[PDB]
Amino acid sequence: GAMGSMERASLIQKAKLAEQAERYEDMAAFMKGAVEKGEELSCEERNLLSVAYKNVVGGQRAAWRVLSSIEQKSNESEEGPEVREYREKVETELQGVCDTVLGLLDSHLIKEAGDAESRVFYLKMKGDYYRYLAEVATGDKKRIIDSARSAYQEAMDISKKEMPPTNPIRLGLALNFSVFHYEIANSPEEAISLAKTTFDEAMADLHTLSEDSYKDSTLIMQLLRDNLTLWT
């Protein structure tokens, strides 16, 4: 790896600089290098890893959507192969990023994660990047969807046993599993039920929280509420 000669701490320091500079491809390469040093990741380092790849894949998804829409309109008008070719190029790059993240989780972040906060974070991530693969998949599709579902479900079982209902990781997991149900799995009733029960149980636990934790949890709860407003 091209980061094999750089110190772990220097890679983390440069990841933080790339974030300030909005250089997210660099940020992801630095954090991949950090993971490949073989030590477990702290809470802050896990969030750097997630921020970097979420921004990289987020730009790819936005581009694939523009191009797929142009491609679909062309098949309703006048006629060549360029639109399909360039959508395939972007799609292939997107899948490579997803495969890179899933490879880091499998070698060996997940198997070394013993605490609930790290294990749930990484299993959620696995579900997320199989979900991004599913958005562009065309049968194959079914195995990818089941891999996302399986990772989210394992994360959910742990989080319900081990975390309070207002925990931001538990909330973000439930939010994203509900989006999976609505957008990927054709199960809008399951999406709605999960979002409502997640929101209601967090509401009833807010009284236990400090002012800072209260702000953290209610921020994510608002996203559950926004989705419910769109879905109903």
Binding site: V51, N176, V179, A191, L219, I220, N227
Partner: peptide
């Protein structure tokens, strides 16, 4: 309109 997923 697309559903909102978790923020950073």
């Amino acid at each position: 309109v697309r559903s909102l997923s978790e923020r950073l």
